[PDB]
Symmetry: D2
Subunit: 255 residues, 4 copies
């Protein structure tokens, strides 16, 4: 994976613990040029400090809230003008109201359910449609998911249904975009201590279970997700699309 | 499988070809009391005509548009007062705009995507929550899905992401309502000529492929979906929950 | 589901706790004629005793060790001569050495691995081939599997790989016999205290993990598997083949 | 992915079309030391000739017929004395009798069934057990499987059941070898013209179906499998075990 002269757009860095920052560090080590997208300024002022650790010679930062078509459209349009054609997108965006991530799934509000779907699933479709405009020779799109999209996990609740939806999103996009030579895949990350992970009910109990039961008997980290993102974003994975790669210490394969 | 002194709510009959009317003939044949819900006054009219084919001595009909919290909430509450406690719900409800059921999935609109999720997946969650109120003793809830929820199938597009969502919805509901003795399951029906089928591009091609490639080499019909629904709604399936049963001539198991 | 004038062959009753005896009580309650096959002379003796609590007017019992082609061939030929044509077969047969079962999977012996395949998987293929001659107009064949065929489960070792083989065997048989109108399916039973459970290390802790985690929060029993077998063996499941129905309180659906 | 100072054992090159020779070319290009195992004289001769395309400063060739324990034990032991500790194994070994790769599954002989299991699935267990001795520090083991192990595919028959078994073998090995920091994974390759493909009935038809229907609308090749093998054998995938990566142009995601 030498990624010199590759350009990747990385969506969803909030702080130094975000899974996308592990992705970022890894691609940065391999010589890629990185463009970053963020939702609010609390991530901008902060992103800017995090980018000091990378060897990125310049900060390419764009505000995009994936709840707005116009921000996704105008965003990717600006990126093309500032930076040219890209080679891929790392999508690491998700959201649910805290109230819907604990206690009873059956009590989920319509508003909260549709919000999770909007941000955590639909946002890949629109990102992919707009990013394709910048990948005329082909490219690669990767989304983060979690095992709770495939099994019912205590507490994860509405996010589990949004992830299930994201994983299908990835397959329907793989089928659509395949003839344009754009591969679309998911990385199912094991549990990692992030900002968003404070929102999930019973998180520490998740970590400990991994350590006890997963084949490798340890948890994974951001850099391990990034190393697999690197394979997926590069030519190493050229025959692989519509795939879900579990980077979770083997936990997915046991019961 | 005798269902005398059982009561089931069937959601989603629009005409004689509906999958839900297959369920109805089977449950009615086995002695159950049925309650029907519908959206369009056209569907109530068809129901009044089709009830003359059933053994149901009286017509129990409720207009419930599942897009309205109020209509579902007041619909079940009313059902409870008219017939008392129920034994299960057969959910056979789905919708997507025609624009979003052909050509390119990467071009799906936000509005088109959330609309399919709202009707086709979330409706199950809110229906279960209100139906739980009429099943103090336990009961059984069954929803209708398609293979396109598990694989990217051509043209099914926004509905496939909706069915993936529905199937996860079934697992999360299974987990949450299990301790209340309420089973939640899914029938994955093979292609059947219905009104809604008319909006799926390539639908004749799908039928023909079943005949040629599925293990049984024949299509299924609505009564066959009904017969598995009887199994799922009844004590026969008492240790079965969170499950997806493919009533599709074996098609899911081949490639 | 009424089964008068039907004839089913049941393989693998050793005693009252056997899963197949649960199948037998259910089919007997439903009016089926039953034929029983056994390996050890002790199982024939338990069978002559267990028959007293069934409605079967005649004991039809046949020694068939599935390690021997000639016993399977001669045994079904003789069944056809004594009772005529049959409507299906319940296969409830598996075996592995303690010595392979009990200690690291990577240390499994060739002879142990192949023995477990032979009895636990290949036996389905030869039985189906011989049973099909007694089903000129179609019928149904059900085999018993366990979740450890789909995931790596602690201690289940060589038998996990044999159940993975057995579930593939079901699909390949489904595809092959589908055009003769013979359906082939699997029941994934949850854990149940039987004579064979005593070969699974940590059985007690598996039982307890179901009660704590399975959506239904309780273990299943042999009758529950029999009620799902009745469904699969009867015309209720007519559009169902190549399927794997989990009768495990929803445990397959959670992580 | 720089593989200098790694040593890998590659099992099952027979000629220039073998999937393992695509693996070899990639690993060799990345700086790895390679050790090759073979069964037939003819294969050792092709290997001698194919080594001239590689940069291997020496030929490390070992006759290992995986039907014999003594050969696998003595093979790896010899390898350990000649090259020292290794970093992993690529397993590219399968076999079935021709008559078992076409026509009707139900007619498979016991001898042919167990022969396919022995060579194509059990071999991984014994090889893992022996290779583990040369990986005190950790390492990576990769097997080659086919989608026919997950679904029933016309003509693949007894090899479909042997791959179902291989894929479970990979999960059970992962669970067992995980605490020794040994990862075990599979690549599910799409169809590729090789010597062994000539035994798969309808092979050309399978290839055309990929071009027509798979997301990427083109077939894969041996080098593309080898690039994924590089990812699995290397530290890029340090968090990935018990996984099955489909290198098949997305065909696994579609129905
Ligand atoms: N950490 C884990 O254990 C874990 C495991 C498996 C999968 N995942 C997945 O990995 C991804 C990243 O989560 P994380 O753990 O890295 O947490 P994180 O650091 O909190 O990242 C979540 C990111 O999503 C962004 N986001 C939320 N709503 C957005 C919107 N409307 N528009 C644009 N961006 C928005 C957030 O930006 P703002 O803060 O600026 O709002 C934040 O950067 C998620 O998809 C998550 O589901 C996480
Ligand atoms: N035919 C197939 O090949 C096939 C295969 C697999 C799964 N299915 C599933 O089977 C289920 C039933 O569909 P079908 O083929 O039987 O078609 P159908 O006869 O057209 O039934 C669709 C039903 O959905 C109802 N519906 C739509 N939106 C609603 C809303 N907002 N509120 C309440 N009801 C609403 C419709 O009622 P109104 O007409 O009153 O609006 C109609 O009764 C669907 O979930 C579908 O996805 C169908
Ligand atoms: N119990 C569970 O929790 C559990 C869970 C999931 C799946 N299962 C499956 O359920 C099935 C029934 O097992 P069980 O638990 O009911 O235990 P069981 O009562 O001990 O029944 C096992 C049966 O296998 C028969 N058998 C073994 N080798 C045979 C051979 N070579 N030829 C003919 N018959 C042979 C035995 O017959 P003989 O006694 O005459 O030797 C015995 O009747 C098995 O396939 C098992 O894997 C069991
Ligand atoms: N081609 C495809 O479309 C495809 C797709 C998916 C998976 N696969 C898998 O890829 C792997 C490699 O096959 P291939 O297509 O590359 O064909 P191949 O070139 O013919 O290789 C098969 C190898 O298996 C070896 N082998 C067979 N029995 C053996 C034994 N008893 N002891 C040691 N080695 C033995 C053969 O060695 P000898 O010639 O010396 O006997 C040969 O080198 C197989 O597992 C196959 O199932 C192939
Ligand atoms: C285990 C886990 C932890 C954190 C996750 O990210 C979230 C969680 C809740 C809301 C938004 C993002 C996640 O997807 C999975
Ligand atoms: C094969 C098939 C046929 C009809 C279906 O029902 C729909 C389809 C699209 C929108 C609403 C209902 C379906 O889910 C699957
Ligand atoms: C949980 C469980 C318990 C018992 C089982 O049956 C066996 C196990 C080992 C050898 C023979 C039969 C089984 O398949 C699964
Ligand atoms: C599509 C395909 C083609 C070739 C294969 O390799 C075999 C096939 C039969 C016996 C030995 C090796 C295979 O596993 C899958
Ligand atoms: N043939 C139409 C629709 C098929 C139908 O449902 O009748 C199309 O492909 O657009
Ligand atoms: N529906 C039946 C039994 C279904 C179930 O097993 O929950 C009842 O109300 O008792
Ligand atoms: N407890 C014993 C036997 C298991 C059992 O069958 O309960 C073991 O784990 O070695
Ligand atoms: N298709 C022919 C030729 C074999 C092959 O394609 O490999 C067959 O039925 O065997
Ligand atoms: N196979 C590499 C590392 C693989 C791993 O991360 O275990 C050496 O050792």
């Amino acid at each position: 994976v030498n990624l010199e002269n590759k350009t990747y757009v990385i969506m969803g860095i909030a702080n130094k613990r975000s899974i996308a920052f592990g992705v970022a560090k890894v691609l940065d080590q391999l010589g890629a040029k990185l463009v970053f997208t963020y939702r609010k300024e609390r991530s901008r002022k902060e992103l800017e400090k995090l980018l000091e650790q990378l060897n990125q010679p310049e900060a390419h930062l764009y505000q995009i809230d994936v709840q707005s078509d116009e921000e996704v459209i105008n965003g990717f349009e600006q990126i093309g003008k500032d930076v040219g054609n890209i080679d891929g997108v790392y999508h690491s965006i998700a959201f649910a109201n805290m109230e819907d991530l604990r206690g009873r799934f059956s009590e989920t509000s319509r508003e909260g359910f549709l919000l999770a779907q909007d941000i955590s699933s639909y946002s890949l479709t629109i990102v992919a449609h707009e990013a394709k405009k910048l990948m005329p020779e082909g490219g690669s799109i990767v989304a983060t998911t979690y095992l709770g999209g495939e099994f019912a996990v205590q507490n994860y609740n509405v996010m589990g249904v949004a992830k299930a939806s994201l994983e299908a999103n990835v397959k329907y996009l793989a089928l659509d975009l395949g003839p344009d030579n754009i591969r679309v895949n998911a990385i199912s990350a094991g549990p990692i201590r992030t900002l968003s992970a404070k929102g999930v009910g019973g998180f520490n109990t998740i970590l400990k279970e991994i350590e006890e039961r997963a084949p490798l008997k340890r948890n994974v980290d951001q850099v391990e997700v990034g190393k697999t993102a690197a394979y997926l974003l590069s030519d190493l994975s050229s025959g692989v699309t519509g795939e879900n790669i579990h980077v979770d210490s083997g936990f997915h394969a046991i019961k």
